[PDB]
C-alpha cells in the first residue's frame, strides 16, 4: 500500500535534509505509528506522501485515495454537518457512526439546533471540540489511506482513549492508517512503528522489537 525506499528530501536547496534515508513498507489495512521529538520531520514525511514535498533521492509508492488529518484543526463557515460531510455525499449511518466514534454526539446533542448550529459569525467551540470535528471530517471521507498527524494533541487523555479505541482501532479497523503519535498506549496497537529523530530513522519495526529495549 505505502512504500518508501532510501528517501531523502530538503525544504531549502543547499540546506539540511528534513528527512534522511527513510525506509518503510505499510501493507493494506495496517497501522503505522510515527513517533519522534518535536521537529523530527514527522509532518514533513506525511507532506511527502501528499506530494507537497519532493524527494531529492529515493522512491515513494501509493494509491491516490488519501484522507489527511492535520495537527492543526480547521473549521469552515457553516453548520457542524456542513463541516463534517464537506464535499462528500451524505449517508446517515456513516455520519452518525463517525460522530459517535469521534466523541461528538454528546456535544452536538447539547445544542437545540444539534448539527445545524452555525460554526466558525457563529458559535466558538473548544480546542477539543474543534479537533474532534476536524478528525470526524477526515474519517468521514472514504479513502484508501488515512494520514492522521497528531490528532489527539489538544484532546484530554479520557476522550483520546475513547477516540483511539472506537475510531482509529474499531471504525477504521480495515483501512491503511499512518498515525503520528509518541504514546506507548497507541504504539502497542500499531502493526509497525517508525521513530524519527532530526530527520533520521532511529527505529523501524514491530512493538515486540521496540519492547526488546
Amino acid at each position, epitope marked *: 500500500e505505502v512504500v518508501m525506499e532510501n528517501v531523502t528530501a530538503f525544504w531549502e536547496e543547499g540546506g539540511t535534509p528534513v528527512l534522511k534515508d527513510i525506509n518503510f513498507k505499510i501493507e493494506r489495512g495496517q497501522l503505522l505509528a510515527v513517533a519522534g521529538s518535536t521537529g523530527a520531520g514527522k*509532518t514533513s514525511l506525511l507532506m511527502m506522501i501528499m506530494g507537497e514535498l519532493e524527494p531529492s533521492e529515493g522512491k515513494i509508492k501509493h494509491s491516490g485515495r488519501i484522507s489527511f488529518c*492535520s*495537527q*492543526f484543526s*480547521w473549521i469552515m463557515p457553516g453548520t457542524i454537518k456542513e463541516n463534517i460531510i464537506f464535499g462528500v455525499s451524505y449517508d446517515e449511518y456513516r455520519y452518525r457512526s463517525v460522530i459517535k466514534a469521534c466523541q461528538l454526539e454528546e456535544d452536538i446533542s447539547k445544542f437545540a439546533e444539534k448539527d445545524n448550529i452555525v460554526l466558525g459569525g457563529g458559535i*466558538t467551540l473548544s*480546542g477539543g471540540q474543534r479537533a474532534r470535528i476536524s478528525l470526524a471530517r477526515a474519517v468521514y471521507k472514504d479513502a484508501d489511506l488515512y494520514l492522521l498527524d497528531s490528532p489527539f494533541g489538544y484532546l484530554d487523555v479520557l476522550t483520546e482513549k475513547e477516540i483511539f479505541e472506537s475510531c482509529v482501532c474499531k471504525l477504521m479497523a480495515n483501512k491503511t492508517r499512518i498515525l503520528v503519535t509518541s504514546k506507548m498506549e497507541h504504539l502497542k496497537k500499531a502493526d509497525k512503528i517508525l521513530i524519527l529523530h532530526e530527520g533520521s530513522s532511529y527505529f523501524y519495526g514491530t512493538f515486540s522489537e521496540l519492547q526488546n529495549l
Partner: nanobody
C-alpha cells in the same frame, strides 16, 4: 490591520527565564504570520522567531535556537515567546509584528508592529 500589544518584559539574572505575550486586536488573526523581533542598543531590528497563521511553521534565529520557543493561540488572538536560559546578549526591546504575506523572516515584510518591551539580562 491588527493592533499589537506586547507584555512580559523586565529585568532577569543570566540563565533565567522570561515569557513575553502579544495580543492582537482586529480581524483575521490567523491570516497573519506573527514574529518576535529584537532591537539591541545601536543595532537594527533583528528577527528572533516566527509562526505561520495556523502555527504549522515555526522558525528561529540561530542565536536563540534551542532556548526560545514561539507559540500561538488563535482563539485568544495572542502569540507568545518563551525565553529560557537567557544570556546578557538578549538585552533588547522585543517587538511583536504581523505579516500579511506568507513566509518571510525579514522584518521588512512585517507591516503591523507593537510598542515593544525592554528585556534586561544582568550578571
Amino acid at each position: 490591520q491588527v493592533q499589537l500589544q506586547e507584555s512580559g518584559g523586565g529585568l532577569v539574572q543570566a540563565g533565567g527565564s522570561l515569557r513575553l505575550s502579544c495580543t492582537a486586536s482586529g480581524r483575521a488573526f490567523s491570516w497573519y504570520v506573527m514574529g518576535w523581533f529584537r532591537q539591541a542598543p545601536g543595532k537594527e531590528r533583528e528577527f528572533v522567531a516566527t509562526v505561520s497563521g495556523n502555527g504549522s511553521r515555526r522558525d528561529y534565529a540561530d542565536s536563540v535556537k534551542g532556548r526560545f520557543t514561539i507559540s500561538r493561540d488563535n482563539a485568544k488572538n495572542t502569540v507568545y515567546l518563551q525565553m529560557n536560559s537567557l544570556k546578557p546578549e538578549d538585552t533588547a526591546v522585543y517587538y511583536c509584528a504581523a505579516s500579511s504575506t506568507y513566509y518571510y523572516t525579514d522584518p521588512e515584510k512585517y507591516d503591523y508592529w507593537g510598542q515593544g518591551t525592554q528585556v534586561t539580562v544582568s550578571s
